[PDB]
Amino acid sequence: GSSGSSGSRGEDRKLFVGMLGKQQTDEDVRKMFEPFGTIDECTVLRGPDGTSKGCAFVKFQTHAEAQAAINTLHSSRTLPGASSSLVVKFADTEKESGPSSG
Questions:
Q1: Of 78, 74, 76, whose CA–CA distance to 88 is shortest?
Q2: Which residues form the domain of 76?
Q3: What CATH number did the domain enclosing 101 receive?
Q4: Using an 8 Å Cβ cutoff, are 19 and 56 in contact?
């Protein structure tokens, strides 16, 4: 009842996608994630042989849009030859936490 789903911690547009296949690329993911918002920055994590390690970061135009995707995309479909479904969850960027004076 207009409550429950909405409410996630981590104010960060960027998102961490997993369970990706060599077939799926920035193009697919982008056009596949766009349907849930306008993407601005999309980078895929690959190795030396341009092989999709199985993860990619997505940066929507706004947070609201970011959550939208996950809400659904998250464990939604099961890309070809992929153990689990499309694992979509907010991403985390190195931070600086610690004592203020010392």
A1: 74
A2: 1-102
A3: 3.30.70.330
A4: no
Q: Using what technique was this structure determined?
A: NMR
How many distinct structural domains can be found in the chain? 1
CB 90 within 8 A of CB 25: no
How many Å apart are CA 102 and CA 94, to the nearest integer? 21
Region of 91 on the Ramachandran plot (φ > 0 left; ψ -120 to 50 alpha; else beta):
beta
Beta carbons of 42 and 59 less than 8 angstroms apart: yes
Which tokens belong to 90? 């907010």
User: Distance between CA 46 and CA 88 in Å, rounded?
Assistant: 17
Residue with tokens 């947070």: 63
Amino acid at 3: S
Residue 39: C-alpha distances to residues 1, 17, 65, 81 (Å): 29, 14, 9, 26
